Write a protein that binds this ligand. Structure first.
Ligand SMILES: Nc1ncnc2c1ncn2[C@@H]1O[C@H](COP(=O)(O)O)[C@@H](O)[C@H]1O
Lengths: 33, 250, 315
């Protein structure tokens, strides 16, 4: 029913950019979540 | 009744604590500390996240009626957790909680005598406060959390542990650092947490094979504006928090 | 001290103590402004050891969940200025009191209606993953208008079917002795809805016998009375009953045949009635009829059809 989520191209978004700063880098903090 | 424990920004601004001259940001801070304390105690008492979550919601709701002036967050949190533990069928002995509360609030002093006066007094102060919480909440103890909806959804859209665990993580964070539990229904908050985890993690959920966006399988009111609007509000609330070592740490 | 969502019980006027209770426990009352008849149940706090009774929190959580025509209705929760009361919609009668009253007469058609409401009520609670765990005539209420209601959820808990790898370990010593199913007397902790329906069977028989059919004095005497009525407890009729630690450690009569129908025949007579009872009082909980099947059993769909109770309750 649902295709599998896919890694989007590096976001040029203003939201994705802001989030990367408000929470830190995902690939770095990922292993702690 | 349905819209009883949900408030507008006006109602949140005009809180009981505001009535006694507490900065909006200072009240937000008080809540964040109570949650942090609830989370700490919870992990020590060894209760599930669900138990903590509930206690946190009890707390958020408690302070839409009572003031931080009249009720310290450090007195209420233990009582709230004590109550939540019973409600969620993970009851912890009254002694156990008061001790653990001391371990968190006073890592210094010797665990007071269990036969002394100042202690027996704490046992009553907590039991009393539990009773006040119950009355303040109108004995409405059954809480619905975003986590339930987050899981059911990430299951549906075949998310990786990577993404699923991050969404779940964001859910817990929303209870800690924001008052979304007082503003938006759990299903909506779940969508915000997923949408956020996706942006952060760079995953994108396709449209289903029935031409319906993933959030439509969680809540029929959610739109992409709302997801952007609430994600914005979320990030905004985070920006205002003092040390964001609170996010990634506990 | 603001408290908008918990009203003072003063709003009701107390009229009487109901059921020769224990103390100032349950009162019949009326709203001072609307005249609404209610029943106030004071939350007992003799066991003040561990704060507000967790066992009471349980009851309230469940009462607030269960909203159905044949389940007692929790209106609200009131305080004093401390004590706490659970406020219910008043119910004039209770099945125990009715069957104790010699002047009360139940027609076959009316007994059908009673059992039908009772079973429809059980279907609802089990559907919402709840176990009553204290079935008995005393806990079956009926209103003046003839609507049956299940009551006393102070013993009830929620139940899950998960996780298919580890069984649930619930409180074993539950349900009044006289209404307790065999599986519980044998020491079962992984049980479910079937325990409530065994109770329903005991109650259905009471509708005719007018008294609890199996009044034991000890857990094992109860098991003995069950054997005398339902037949001996053997793996042949209850597969994998050997696994109960107590199956061997309990002196169990070995020769007993099944006498359920033969014994109640004198009281009941109607074949369909005897049959449904025979299916409710089944030793093997896995082979015991459930709520849904019971409600579609011929008993409820053969003459005389079930009828309302209003008329029969004025006497
Ligand atoms: N409407 C009522 N009238 C009289 N007694 C009631 C009523 N509802 C509940 N009770 C009694 O209150 C106790 C708790 O009932 P429950 O709320 O079902 O746990 C039991 O002893 C019931 O028989």
């Amino acid at each position: 029913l649902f295709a599998e989520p896919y890694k989007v191209t590096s976001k040029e978004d203003k939201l994705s950019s802001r989030i990367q700063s408000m929470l830190g880098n995902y690939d770095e903090m990922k292993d702690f979540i | 009744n349905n819209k009883r424990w949900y408030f507008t920004r006006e109602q949140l601004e005009n809180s009981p604590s505001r009535r006694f001259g507490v900065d909006p940001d200072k009240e937000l801070s008080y809540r964040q500390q109570a949650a942090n304390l609830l989370q700490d105690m919870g992990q020590r008492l060894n209760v599930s996240q669900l138990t903590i979550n509930t206690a946190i919601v009890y707390m958020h709701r408690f302070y839409m009626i009572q003031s931080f002036t009249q009720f310290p967050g450090n007195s209420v949190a233990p009582a709230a957790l004590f109550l939540a533990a019973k409600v969620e069928e993970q009851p912890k002995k009254l002694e156990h909680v008061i001790k653990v509360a001391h371990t968190c609030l006073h890592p210094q002093e010797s665990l007071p005598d269990t036969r002394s006066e100042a202690y027996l007094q704490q046992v009553q102060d907590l039991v009393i406060l539990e009773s006040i919480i119950l009355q303040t909440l109108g004995f409405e103890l059954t809480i619905d959390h975003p986590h339930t909806h987050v899981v059911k959804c990430t299951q549906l859209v075949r998310a990786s542990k990577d993404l699923a665990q991050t969404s779940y993580f964001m859910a817990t964070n929303s209870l800690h650092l924001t008052t979304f539990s007082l503003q938006y229904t759990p299903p909506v908050v779940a969508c915000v947490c997923i949408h956020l985890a996706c942006k952060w993690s760079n995953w994108e959920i396709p449209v289903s094979t029935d031409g319906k966006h993933w959030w439509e399988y969680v809540d029929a009111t959610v739109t992409l504006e709302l997801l952007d609007e609430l994600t914005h509000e979320f990030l905004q609330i985070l920006e205002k928090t003092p040390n964001r070592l609170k996010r990634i740490w506990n | 001290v603001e408290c908008p969502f918990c009203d003072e019980v003063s709003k009701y006027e107390k009229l009487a103590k109901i059921g020769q209770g224990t103390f100032g426990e349950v009162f019949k009352a009326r709203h001072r402004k609307t005249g609404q008849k209610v029943a106030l149940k004071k939350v007992l706090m003799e066991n003040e050891k561990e704060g507000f009774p967790i066992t009471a929190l349980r009851e309230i959580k469940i009462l607030q969940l269960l909203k159905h025509e044949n389940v007692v209705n929790l209106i609200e929760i009131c305080r004093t200025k401390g004590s706490i009361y659970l406020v219910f919609d008043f119910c004039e009668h209770d099945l125990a009191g009715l069957l104790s009253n010699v002047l009360v007469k139940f027609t076959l058609s009316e007994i059908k209606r009673v059992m039908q409401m009772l079973l429809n009520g059980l279907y609802y609670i089990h559907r919402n993953k709840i176990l009553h765990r204290d079935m008995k005539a005393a806990n079956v209420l009926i209103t003046r208008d003839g609507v049956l209601k299940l009551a006393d959820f102070g013993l009830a808990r929620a139940f899950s079917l998960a996780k298919n790898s580890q069984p649930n370990r619930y409180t074993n010593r539950v349900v009044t002795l006289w209404y307790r199913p065999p599986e519980l007397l044998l020491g079962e902790r992984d049980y479910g809805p079937p325990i409530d329906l065994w109770g329903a069977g005991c109650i259905m028989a009471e509708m005719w016998t007018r008294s609890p059919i199996m009044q034991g004095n000890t857990e094992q005497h109860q098991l003995a009375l069950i054997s005398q009525l339902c037949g001996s407890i053997t793996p042949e009729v209850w597969p994998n009953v050997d696994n109960y630690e107590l199956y061997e450690k309990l002196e169990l009569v070995k020769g007993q045949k099944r006498k359920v129908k033969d014994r109640l025949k004198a009281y009941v007579r109607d074949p369909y009635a005897l049959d449904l009872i025979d299916k409710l009082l089944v030793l093997d909980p896995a082979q015991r009829i459930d709520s849904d099947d019971a409600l579609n059993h011929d008993f409820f769909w053969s003459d005389p059809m079930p009828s309302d109770l209003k008329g029969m309750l004025s006497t």
